[PDB]
């Protein structure tokens, strides 16, 4: 028989190999598939879909319906934050549970741009102007509008169009960021501050809620497949 | 407990290869790993052990690191593993240039964090020469066969 020499690796089983092997049921009549609506080809496709972010994860608000609601009010104007959020989609408790994060939890590295969308949910008569801002890392996370306004941001006016979108432009030292909390691959800060204030006329609920969504952009990608921690089997 | 090792993947644990790689500032290379396993008994006894298998599971940064030799982690639904049967030719797998940068960095004159003034020294402190603590991940190796009366 053709002279051969066995090389390193033979007989070993790689769980990620891609070899041919014998078939158990030769000549099996496979039933043809049908046009089942909504077919997916790539994980990222799901990543680009907006998903509601559980922002307020207080011990009394975590794991409930209240976590997604960020309550605003008609209190006088201040420069203190409404909500802070760190750009680490796969490691920050808040983001890590949204579609994006979950998919992200199956990879070691992520890259691309992200976009946050905020939905106002007050009465028609309620007006206002908010400021959502993404500050790249490497400095003091803003605590006052004064600082946040110095970075990347969108000044949103509440009106007939109820939803506003601020894109977080991919600005990073490395071509790919770690899917875990890391300084070297840090992401920065997402912040929301009252631009003016919330104003409501009489006989109107003085406090209402805003809902947040997040989604990857056409330019986003993920690499180095890995096992997730968001699930386990004890014994 | 049954000894199962976890090693942080880095060329700097040994001397030889490191110095060779240190002849330059940066590099890119598809990486080939080979696995030479060697076993023996320990206790004075004439007992028997049937040919042993060994799983080498690559745990990329952030993935669940096994805490037990028989816990869920060894299911490896996404991790790349290699089940080596003892006695056969050494194990080998190919890993491409998996760097987060446009070149692997042998020397990194800098810190991961920046010590801000509106922050406590502790909060802004880090190592000198380090990028990401977890650069490539860890390998996890365990005997697949269960307990045997002879060690």
């Amino acid at each position: 028989g053709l002279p051969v020499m066995n090389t390193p690796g033979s007989n070993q089983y790689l769980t990620a190999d891609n070899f041919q092997s014998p078939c158990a049921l030769p000549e099996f009549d496979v039933t043809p598939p049908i046009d089942i609506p909504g077919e997916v080809k790539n994980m990222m496709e799901l990543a680009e879909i907006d998903t509601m972010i559980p922002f307020d994860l207080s011990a009394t608000k975590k794991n409930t319906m209240e976590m997604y609601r960020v309550r605003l009010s008609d209190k006088p104007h201040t420069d203190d934050p409404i909500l802070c959020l760190s750009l680490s989609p796969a490691s920050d408790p808040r983001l890590s549970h949204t579609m994006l994060g979950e998919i992200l939890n199956y990879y070691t590295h992520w890259a691309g741009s992200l976009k946050f969308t905020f939905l106002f949910c007050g009465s028609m008569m309620a007006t206002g102007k908010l400021l959502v801002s993404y500050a790249p890392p490497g400095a003091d996370p803003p605590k006052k509008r004064k600082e946040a306004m110095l970075g990347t941001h969108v000044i949103w006016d509440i009106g007939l169009q109820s939803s506003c979108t601020m894109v977080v432009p991919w600005i990073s030292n490395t071509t790919y960021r770690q899917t875990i909390d890391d300084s070297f691959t840090e992401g920065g800060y997402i912040s929301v501050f009252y631009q003016t204030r919330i104003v409501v006329p009489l006989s109107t609920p003085r406090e209402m809620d805003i809902l947040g969504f997040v989604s990857a952009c056409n330019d986003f990608s993920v690499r180095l497949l890995r096992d997730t921690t968001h699930i386990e089997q004890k014994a | 407990d049954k000894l199962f090792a976890v090693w942080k993947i880095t060329y700097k644990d040994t001397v030889q290869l490191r110095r060779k790689l240190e002849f330059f500032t940066y590099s890119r290379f598809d990486m080939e790993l080979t696995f030479v396993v060697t076993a023996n008994f320990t206790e004075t006894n004439n007992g028997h052990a049937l040919n042993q298998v060994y799983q080498i599971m690559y745990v990329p940064p952030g993935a669940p690191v096994p805490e037990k030799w028989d816990d869920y982690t060894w299911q490896t639904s996404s991790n790349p593993s290699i089940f080596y049967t003892y006695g056969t030719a050494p194990a080998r797998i190919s890993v491409p240039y998996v760097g987060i940068s446009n070149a692997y960095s042998h020397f990194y004159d800098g810190f991961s964090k920046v010590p801000l003034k509106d922050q406590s020294a502790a909060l802004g402190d880090s190592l000198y020469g380090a990028a990401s603590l977890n650069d490539f991940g860890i390998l996890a190796v365990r005997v697949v066969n269960d307990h045997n009366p002879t060690k």
Partner: nanobody
Amino acid sequence: QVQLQESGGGSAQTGGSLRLSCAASGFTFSHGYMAWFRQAPEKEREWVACVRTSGVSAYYADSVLGRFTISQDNAKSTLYLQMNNLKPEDTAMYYCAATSISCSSGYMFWGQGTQVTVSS
């Protein structure tokens, strides 16, 4: 199998002191740090203190300053957390997070933790 196992208990009266220990094994590649973290009853996990590899250079959390003492015995491959002046804010779970680090945040190994209770 870098086995991190905490000890030290937690059932003191208000004002006392406890000795929180942590047995370490596996391969702790010395260089980096070794630390302590608390989760608290109902709060976010918070950093307590970090000590350098073998070096006795350390820091403490603003909240715990001077009232907690973190050392080490690399001969015994252990780290210690002496805690004087325990209080109602200190009542919580404590974790020996001693691996990698390089700073005061990065990890690949934690422990099972132990609870402390400062009653009064």
